[PDB]
Homo-oligomer: A and B are copies of this chain.
Amino acid sequence: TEQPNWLMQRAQLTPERIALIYEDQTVTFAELFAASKRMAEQLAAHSVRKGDTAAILLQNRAEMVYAVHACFLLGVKAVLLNTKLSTHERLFQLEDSGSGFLLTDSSFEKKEYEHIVQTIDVDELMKEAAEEIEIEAYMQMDATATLMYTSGTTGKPKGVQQTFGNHYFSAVSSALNLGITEQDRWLIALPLFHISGLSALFKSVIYGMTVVLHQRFSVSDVLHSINRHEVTMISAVQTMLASLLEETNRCPESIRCILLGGGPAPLPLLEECREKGFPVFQSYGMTETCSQIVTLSPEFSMEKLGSAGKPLFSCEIKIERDGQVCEPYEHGEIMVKGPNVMKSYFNRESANEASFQNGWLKTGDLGYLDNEGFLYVLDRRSDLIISGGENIYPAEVESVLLSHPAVAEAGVSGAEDKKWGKVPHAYLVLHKPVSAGELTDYCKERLAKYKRPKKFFVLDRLPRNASNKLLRNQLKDARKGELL
């Protein structure tokens, strides 16, 4: 039921091994444990207690890594907040998660959260003296460790409860797939508030593996850092991968794995990576599975071009249509099972009832298996748009647009975009006149920047079926004029 705290045990086993490279800082596992314990001590002085929930709002920094581990050492659930959200979106997640604390810094406006939660500046925190405490020496396998919001298909996101067991099994199953050696070093340049970034911190302490951490993604900095630090592993969404190949015809020799996830990649990009020797491992995974649950090796990447691979060890996948399992190549809903699959959504009894069916999680994605069991994800959802690896839910964007008094009805769908893959376009029926600029200013207070419509169209009615349900796939073809 329990394991020794991973960071604590890792510091006991290999104290001097490097845990984190960040800018000009190198942090050993012994130093990481000491810093996380000290932050935990300072948090306990601000009355944080075992069983509490603490939200984290930070850019990728060493201090963010300390805060996550410090929560674990106190027995406190960590809510990872997306730094690009508007205040309005964060406030809902602070309230819905039951967070009693917000750990952030001066680059965010702490004042507008004072009413809901006790706000703590991580940099001022670390300057304070505090009593020593007895830390939580054990992680309970079925306890919720972290919460991440996603799947806003009804208009508001759901908090995914990720257990310590989920994270352990994700890291173990990935190591069984990719192999692990003492020389491996993993570069993380995507957000730590997504499981793509955060999972590397759990791999780090479980494997005893260095993470090279970047605050932002810059191709030139990443190539320099790979060379300076002998990086062997790197995670990317397809936009990042495309930017890398835009920069160089050759992959750095030390890279043995580019773990690609977070949405579909254009086929010519995968073909060019294979032709030029970039060792891309395409993968399929989500917040609910605590990162990858299916991965595709480069040796199959051309024969199975388009596939996300096979399930990781201990994990399982099937394709069902209306509760009947599908034959090979027959399209249906992707359902997954495994020790890395989330406990449940937080405080969403009805969604949990619908999403789980006898131990399997319904993903809401459509796909098929070929006759050797390789997974092919079909890009057919209209309730989800993926831009630069960031999920966007039309129901959320439509809810915000409807709230404007000039707006009678609203529909949002994804438009092709050479850089971002897809971007949201808005389709409106209006009571009163309103310009695109007005609408964009109105959305800025309520939606993260990547969620706001890149184009607006005006219609007399939107396409609906006989049950009055919006037909989002038909928006791009309806009689419309562009709104300026």
* A180: Cβ under 8 A from any B Cβ: yes
From known contacts A172-B172, A175-B175, infer whether A4 and B316 are also in contact, taking CB-CB under 8 Å: yes
Give residues of chain A (174-195) contacting chain B, Cβ–Cβ below 8 Å.
175-176, 179-182
A316 — which chain B residues lie within 8 A by C-beta? 4
A176-B207, A181-B181 as given contacts; A314 in contact with B3, CB under 8 Å? yes
Task: Say yes or no: A176-B176 contact (C-beta < 8 A), given A4-B314, A9-B313.
Answer: no
Cα distance, A175 to B313, chains bound together (Å): 14
A12 at the interface (CB under 8 A from B): yes
The residues of B that contact A285 with a CB separation of less than 8 Å are none
Contact with B along A1-36 (1 / 0, CB 8 A): 001100001101100000000000000000000000
Q: Chain B contacts of A206 at CB under 8 A?
A: 176, 313
B-side contacts of A310, CB under 8 Å: 12-13
How far, in whole Å, are A4 and B373 apart by their CA atoms in the complex? 15
Contact with B along A300-314 (1 / 0, CB 8 A): 000000000011011
> Interface digits, A274-304 against B, CB 8 Å rule (1 contact, 0 not)?
0000000000000000000000000000000
What 6 A-B pairs are tightest by C-beta distance, nearest first? A179-B181, A3-B314, A172-B172, A179-B180, A13-B310, A12-B373
14 extra A-B contacts, CB within 8 A, seeds A10-B313, A176-B208: A12-B310, A12-B373, A13-B311, A172-B172, A172-B176, A175-B175, A175-B176, A176-B180, A176-B206, A179-B179, A179-B180, A179-B181, A179-B182, A180-B180
Q: Please give the residue numbers on chain A whose beta carbons come within 8 Å of chain B beta carbons, in ascending order.
A: 3-4, 9-10, 12-13, 172, 175-176, 179-182, 206-208, 310-311, 313-314, 316, 339, 373
